[PDB]
Paper text:
KEOPS cooperates with Sua5/YRDC to catalyze the biosynthesis of tRNA N6-threonylcarbamoyladenosine (t6A), an essential modification needed for fitness of cellular organisms. We show that A. thaliana KEOPS is composed of KAE1, BUD32, CGI121 and PCC1, which adopts a conserved overall arrangement.
With 232 232 picks, we determined a map of AtKEOPS at an overall resolution of 3.2–5.5 Å. The reconstruction shows six KEOPS subunits―KAE1, PCC1, PCC1, KAE1, BUD32 and CGI121, but no presence of a tRNA molecule. The dissociation of BUD32–CGI121 from KAE1–PCC1 in one KEOPS protomer was probably due to the structural damage at air–water interface during sample preparation. Imposing local refinement, we managed to determine almost a complete structure of AtKEOPS complex with exception for the C-terminal tail of KAE1 (residues 341–353), N-terminal end (residues 1–13) and C-terminal tail (residues 222–226) of BUD32, and N-terminal end of PCC1 (residues 1–15). We modelled a Fe2+ ion in the binding sphere of H113–H117–D298 motif in KAE1 based on crystal structures of Kae1/OSGEP proteins. Our structure shows a distance of ∽25 Å between Arg220 of BUD32 and t6A-catalytic site of KAE1.
Author numbering:
A (entry chain C): 2 to 172
B (entry chain A): 4 to 340
C (entry chain D): 16 to 94
D (entry chain B): 14 to 221
E (entry chain F): 16 to 92
F (entry chain E): 3 to 339
């Protein structure tokens, strides 16, 4: 699905469950064999499309001012969703590891052909963008993001995640 | 017309002011106990200087004003705050003058005198008033008939901070260490980092002074910066911080005009920054001048004139000078009426 | 312990009473360490001051003579 | 443009396809360039930290959407609700509903106690500040511009004193709420004794 | 014109007599402008200064208080 | 048994307490000095304050160093004069109190005789004619029929006063003494300037010489024609010539064998050198003690007090007065006869 962003940009999203070649995906990301730019995130750490849209806005601002701290804009995105100042730990935890078969593949202003060929490249089951609440791993969200029980009683998990993503640079 | 006489001796500066109701000084022989360079003032020798000078000073005030003692409507002494000995000398002389001339003694506060003199000089009706001096660093707003303070140093005043920083650097003492610091800073060209030290609606200067002393001592021997740069950076930092504080004061009480009074008001950088802020926020800073902002008897006499023509008075048996006398205790009956 | 009385002769009764009353209203900073009382007789102003210690006594009399000199100068200027 | 603050500005726009508000701390001209950059960055970090901490204490606040470091902007969720001042004006004009007033006083007292026990003052607890969410009647707090962190009970007492002074200033058309708010704070707080001692001390200071 | 009459506390009579025979036998600076008399009763001094001018009397006060403290600090051992 | 007499010296800003034995040995000589701002002379009041501060510790140090209990002290000696009234009266009060507590007789002692006798017992001289030249004394003393009679002296001012006044004119430092700075600057002198010859008969005058050389110093420093070193050289050589000439005339008149010199001004080296040369020419010896005795101190007075007491002449406790001029000839020697 393609969703609009700021200043007329768009982003294409595709959720896949039961990925069988996750190790091959990680190897290709490491060696850069794939020609198209794409980011793979551990989709279990996502409660809603809204935090991803916020990270997309952050990466768009970084690219527009050409302030991509990481080598690629998609790696900039995956580092952005982590909310930590340590790039290596961010990639290890929030980026895909060898134990993530529930993978989100996204691209910036992607054409339908690019998403179709990406879907051809992946051996998995495509899922919509509404099961996140059902598949959100809230326990590790509270563990990593230090979300208080008082926070949960006045707001949802996604709002706290979005606030932390925004306020990373405030620390 | 109505004329009030006021005595000011709360600091090393001594003043015998004689004023009318319009705000125009008739005479103002102001004298200073000129301390040796590198040294401050102590109550005993300051009192000795006052003993030697006040009678010639009062004679000079009478000769300059040419106003008969009977023409005085009220004789007013600065109750304080300030060091005990000069206020005590002023108390004795005002008691004697009241019992001889048969004239009413009025205790007058100092900050109220500064605010009223500034307001009458610049014609402002009800602005936030910033009184900055050697022993005072105050942001004051009228409220419910009382001059409530909203911005205040908790540890040490900005003027004392400048003074003993200059003494650390051993500046001259004419006409004031602040003036010499300003002259030195006029050649300052380099900025220097100072920590953020504004909390709530108040500022602390003792930590700021300690930090700038440490930096100056570290940089002078290492020739990393000139004292001019140190003075300029300190001046800009403190005045930007005071801009922030008085802007918060503007927001809280919803005030538009701005008045500046006190010794540091003799400077011009404060006026430039304040007028810039007023232009940004559609305000109108009112300017300053030396004869209407330095410690002397004119402002004291003017506040006394207000208090006497309003009705408040103090008997001769109640001529109890105080080392501490807050501004809010003065019930501003003049403005409500 | 330590104490004495001092006299000053004025032109008339009025000046003695003025000095008496003007210095009378002057409170004492430390009532627990020094004490002052006084009498007036014709133009003679007698001031009985009593202090506990010698240094405090000397300082008190020094200040007292100073303020007496102030009063005398003021009266002579405005007799 | 919605409103311009004394030190910053608030703007209306759309973030991530959602209705949003933009609180932009545009560079003021009272600071030198390096000085301005330093204070803007530091106070932006402080505001974000204050929002995070007040969220951690179970007090409802607008949700922080995104932070642009190279533009000094705050993006916040838009909240639908009613102001306390409007409700109190309605009480004064058309009659005070005692049960609604008591519930509002209890809720605001509980929220104030919850924020106060965390050792973080607010300083601007004015009726224009807190809102009540429509439909859910839930209390929310905004405008962290003057928030300062300290453990001194003096600050909490000063905050309560300013709150009651503002309540007096907005006229007693809705009646006297000092008793209700004090009882709510007593029933909600645990260190209320020292806070009320310091509040009484501040009250005697300000009465003169 | 100006005068003062010190009456001073002392433990024993001989201390007052010592102060007498020490200070009184000394001849003061100038009889023209000032007069001084001193007497002893029991262990109590009675020391009267009379002077034309208060500043001269105060200088005498300084000298007398200092020398009396000196005598006490000498006797105390 | 070595009977011990406790003595004081306070004739000047130098405060001293002395304990001596029959042979002149000093069991304890504690002493203290007062410093003055340059270009001015010390005033009596602050000098008396310093004396009051330092008198008790000096006696304490004397009793500690001598290791002699105050009971073992046999009599008390007070310096009758000459000297300033305030320190003399302080010493008189202290000696009177000590005598009343310890029950020891009091004796009044002169200062010049003390100088003469201590120099005699130090240098081993038999009975020489003595020139005492200092800041307060400039005289020639010779023993005759039990009286230390005066043969030659200054007629206008002691040359110590002239030297100190010219040093103040030249703005020389008072540390450690203006005389030492004058001597060193003269040692740096290069040019000699003529001065008036003001020797009347066999005595000397210095007021006219001082005025002339002050005028010359002002003219030459104004025109930068010479350095102050040349001025000091000229003054030193001229005054040395005058003093040694009158010393020679007195020596010839008195018909003696050897001559003794004493005084702070006697600390100079050019004098002692050239005058010992001319004494060797005159078949005479030079006696010149160290600077420790040339300056005033208590052990100076103590030995003459011991000499007076051992004979049996006493002094009533009521006559413990002082004078501005306690002339040497008024004391009749009884110990030598
Ligand atoms: Fe002032």
């Amino acid at each position: 699905k393609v969703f609009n962003l700021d200043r007329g940009n768009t982003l294409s999203v595709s959720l896949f469950s039961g990925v069988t070649n996750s190790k091959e995906l990680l190897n290709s990301m490491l060696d850069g064999s794939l020609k198209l730019e794409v980011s793979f995130l551990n989709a279990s750490l996502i409660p809603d499309i809204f935090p991803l849209l916020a990270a997309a806005q952050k990466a768009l601002i970084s690219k527009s001012r050409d302030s991509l701290s990481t080598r690629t804009l998609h790696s900039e995105l995956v580092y952005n969703y982590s909310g930590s100042k340590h790039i290596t730990e961010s990639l290890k935890r929030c980026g895909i590891s060898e134990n993530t078969t529930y993978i989100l593949a996204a691209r910036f202003n992607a054409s339908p052909v690019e998403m179709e060929e990406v879907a051809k490249l992946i051996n998995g089951k495509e899922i919509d963008l509404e099961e996140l609440k059902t598949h959100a791993n809230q326990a590790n969200i509270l563990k990593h993001y230090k979300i208080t029980s008082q926070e949960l009683g006045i707001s949802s998990l996604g709002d706290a995640i979005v606030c932390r993503i925004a306020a990373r640079d405030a620390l | 017309k109505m004329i009030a006489i006021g005595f000011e001796g709360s600091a090393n500066k001594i003043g015998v002011g004689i004023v009318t109701l319009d705000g125009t000084i008739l005479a103002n022989p102001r004298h200073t106990y000129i301390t040796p360079p590198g040294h401050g003032f102590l109550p005993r020798e300051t009192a000795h200087h006052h003993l030697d000078h006040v009678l010639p000073l009062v004679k000079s005030a009478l000769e300059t004003s040419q106003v008969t003692p009977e023409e005085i409507d009220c004789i007013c002494y600065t109750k304080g705050p300030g060091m005990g000995a000069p206020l005590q000398v002023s108390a004795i002389v005002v008691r004697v003058l009241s019992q001889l001339w048969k004239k009413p003694i009025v205790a007058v506060n100092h900050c109220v005198a500064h605010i009223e003199m500034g307001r009458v000089v610049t014609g402002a009706d009800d602005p936030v008033v910033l009184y900055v001096s050697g022993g005072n660093t105050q942001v004051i707003a009228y409220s419910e008939g009382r001059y409530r303070i909203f911005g205040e140093t908790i540890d040490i005043a900005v003027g004392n901070c400048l003074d003993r920083f200059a003494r650390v650097l051993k500046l001259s003492n004419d006409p004031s260490p602040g003036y010499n610091i300003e002259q030195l800073a006029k050649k300052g060209e380099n900025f220097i980092d100072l920590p953020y030290a504004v909390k709530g609606m108040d500022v602390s200067f003792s930590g700021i002074l300690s930090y700038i002393e440490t930096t100056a001592e570290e940089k002078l021997k290492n020739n990393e910066c000139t004292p001019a740069d140190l003075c300029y950076s300190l001046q800009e930092t403190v005045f930007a911080m005071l801009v922030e504080i008085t802007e918060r004061a503007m927001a809280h009480c919803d005030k538009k005009d701005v008045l500046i009074v006190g010794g540091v008001g003799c400077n011009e950088r404060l006026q430039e920054m304040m007028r810039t802020m007023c232009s940004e926020r559609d305000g109108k800073l009112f300017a300053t001048d030396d004869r209407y902002c330095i410690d002397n008897g004119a402002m004291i006499a003017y506040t006394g004139l207000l208090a006497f023509v309003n009705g408040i008075e103090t008997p001769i048996e109640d001529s109890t000078f105080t080392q501490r006398f807050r501004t809010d205790e003065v019930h501003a009956v003049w403005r409500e009426k | 312990d330590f104490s004495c009385n001092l006299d000053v002769s004025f032109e008339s009764e009025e000046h003695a009473l003025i000095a008496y009353t003007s210095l009378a209203v002057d409170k004492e900073l430390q009532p627990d360490k020094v004490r002052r009382v006084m009498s007036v007789s014709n133009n003679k102003l007698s001031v009985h001051f009593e202090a506990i210690e010698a240094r405090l006594l000397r300082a008190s009399f020094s200040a007292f003579v100073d303020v007496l000199t102030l009063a005398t100068r003021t009266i002579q200027e405005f007799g | 443009l919605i409103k311009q603050g004394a030190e910053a500005r608030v703007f209306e726009s759309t973030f991530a396809g959602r209705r949003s508000i933009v609180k932009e701390r545009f560079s003021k001209k009272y600071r030198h360039p390096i000085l301005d950059a330093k204070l803007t960055l530091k106070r932006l970090n402080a505001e974000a930290r204050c929002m995070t901490k007040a969220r951690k204490l179970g007090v409802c606040t607008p949700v922080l959407y995104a932070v642009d470091t190279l533009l000094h902007s705050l993006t916040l969720e838009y909240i639908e609700g009613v102001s306390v001042k409007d409700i109190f004006l309605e009480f004064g004009t058309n009659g005070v509903v005692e049960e609604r007033l008591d519930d509002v006083a209890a809720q605001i007292g509980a929220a104030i106690a919850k924020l106060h026990d965390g050792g973080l003052a607010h300083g601007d607890l004015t009726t224009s500040n807190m809102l009540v969410r429509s439909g859910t009647n839930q209390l929310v707090l905004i405008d962290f511009g003057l928030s300062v962190t300290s453990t001194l009970p003096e600050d909490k007492a000063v905050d309560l004193y300013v709150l009651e002074r503002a309540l007096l200033s907005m006229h007693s058309s809705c009646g006297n709420v000092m008793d209700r708010i004090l009882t709510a704070y007593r029933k909600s707080s645990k260190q209320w004794s020292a806070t009320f001692n310091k509040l009484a001390q501040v009250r005697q200071r300000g009465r003169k």
